[PDB]
Amino acid sequence: IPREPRRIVIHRGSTGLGFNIVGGEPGEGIFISFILAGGPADLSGELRKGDQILSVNGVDLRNASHEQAAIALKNAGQTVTIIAQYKPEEYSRFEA
Numbered sequence: 001i002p003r004e005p006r007r008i009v010i011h012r013g014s015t016g017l018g019f020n021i022v023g024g025e026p027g028e029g030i031f032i033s034f035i036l037a038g039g040p041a042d043l044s045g046e047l048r049k050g051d052q053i054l055s056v057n058g059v060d061l062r063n064a065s066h067e068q069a070a071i072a073l074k075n076a077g078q079t080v081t082i083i084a085q086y087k088p089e090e091y092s093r094f095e096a
Contacts, residue, residue, distance in 0.1 A: 011078065023094075024066055029062070030061050030066065031090070032053065
Protein backbone atom coordinates (compact mmCIF):
# COMPACT_ATOMS: atom_id res chain seq x y z
CA ILE A 1 0.00 0.00 0.00
CA PRO A 2 1.67 3.24 -1.11
CA ARG A 3 2.08 5.93 1.53
CA GLU A 4 2.11 8.65 -1.14
CA PRO A 5 -1.19 10.40 -1.86
CA ARG A 6 -3.26 8.38 -4.32
CA ARG A 7 -5.93 9.51 -6.78
CA ILE A 8 -9.10 7.38 -6.73
CA VAL A 9 -12.28 7.76 -8.79
CA ILE A 10 -15.46 6.20 -7.39
CA HIS A 11 -18.83 6.03 -9.13
CA ARG A 12 -21.79 6.12 -6.76
CA GLY A 13 -24.04 3.07 -6.80
CA SER A 14 -27.26 2.00 -5.10
CA THR A 15 -25.39 1.68 -1.79
CA GLY A 16 -23.81 5.11 -2.25
CA LEU A 17 -20.02 5.31 -2.39
CA GLY A 18 -19.56 2.17 -0.31
CA PHE A 19 -17.56 3.57 2.59
CA ASN A 20 -17.97 5.51 5.83
CA ILE A 21 -15.87 8.37 7.19
CA VAL A 22 -14.94 9.41 10.70
CA GLY A 23 -13.76 12.82 11.78
CA GLY A 24 -13.99 15.37 14.53
CA GLU A 25 -13.33 19.05 14.90
CA PRO A 26 -11.31 20.90 12.25
CA GLY A 27 -7.72 19.67 12.17
CA GLU A 28 -8.40 16.15 13.45
CA GLY A 29 -8.52 14.71 9.93
CA ILE A 30 -11.11 12.78 7.92
CA PHE A 31 -10.56 9.03 7.65
CA ILE A 32 -12.19 6.01 6.03
CA SER A 33 -13.61 3.96 8.91
CA PHE A 34 -15.37 1.20 6.93
CA ILE A 35 -15.52 -0.11 3.36
CA LEU A 36 -18.56 -2.09 2.23
CA ALA A 37 -17.88 -5.46 0.63
CA GLY A 38 -19.02 -5.39 -2.98
CA GLY A 39 -19.66 -1.65 -2.95
CA PRO A 40 -18.13 0.86 -5.32
CA ALA A 41 -15.09 1.61 -3.14
CA ASP A 42 -14.31 -2.09 -2.72
CA LEU A 43 -14.67 -2.95 -6.41
CA SER A 44 -12.12 -0.24 -7.21
CA GLY A 45 -9.60 -2.04 -5.00
CA GLU A 46 -7.91 1.27 -4.25
CA LEU A 47 -9.28 2.62 -0.96
CA ARG A 48 -8.39 1.34 2.51
CA LYS A 49 -9.73 1.66 6.02
CA GLY A 50 -7.33 4.08 7.69
CA ASP A 51 -6.94 6.26 4.60
CA GLN A 52 -7.12 9.99 5.25
CA ILE A 53 -9.32 11.85 2.78
CA LEU A 54 -7.21 14.80 1.65
CA SER A 55 -9.69 16.11 -0.92
CA VAL A 56 -12.97 15.36 -2.67
CA ASN A 57 -13.50 16.76 -6.17
CA GLY A 58 -10.84 19.37 -5.49
CA VAL A 59 -12.25 20.42 -2.10
CA ASP A 60 -9.41 20.33 0.44
CA LEU A 61 -10.62 18.31 3.43
CA ARG A 62 -7.34 18.01 5.36
CA ASN A 63 -8.57 20.45 8.03
CA ALA A 64 -12.31 19.85 7.64
CA SER A 65 -14.79 18.99 10.37
CA HIS A 66 -16.61 15.67 10.16
CA GLU A 67 -19.75 17.62 9.24
CA GLN A 68 -17.96 19.62 6.54
CA ALA A 69 -16.58 16.43 4.98
CA ALA A 70 -19.91 14.58 5.17
CA ILE A 71 -21.68 17.36 3.27
CA ALA A 72 -18.85 17.61 0.74
CA LEU A 73 -19.18 13.89 -0.03
CA LYS A 74 -22.98 14.06 -0.16
CA ASN A 75 -22.83 16.89 -2.72
CA ALA A 76 -19.90 15.55 -4.75
CA GLY A 77 -22.25 14.14 -7.38
CA GLN A 78 -22.24 10.65 -8.78
CA THR A 79 -18.55 10.47 -9.76
CA VAL A 80 -16.08 11.42 -7.04
CA THR A 81 -12.34 12.07 -7.16
CA ILE A 82 -10.78 11.21 -3.80
CA ILE A 83 -7.19 12.01 -2.93
CA ALA A 84 -6.37 9.55 -0.16
CA GLN A 85 -3.26 8.95 1.93
CA TYR A 86 -2.81 5.89 4.11
CA LYS A 87 -2.48 7.01 7.74
CA PRO A 88 -3.57 4.14 10.01
CA GLU A 89 -1.60 5.58 12.93
CA GLU A 90 -3.70 8.76 12.88
CA TYR A 91 -6.93 6.93 12.05
CA SER A 92 -6.61 4.68 15.08
CA ARG A 93 -7.19 7.66 17.38
CA PHE A 94 -10.84 7.43 16.28
CA GLU A 95 -11.37 3.66 16.47
CA ALA A 96 -12.47 2.11 19.77
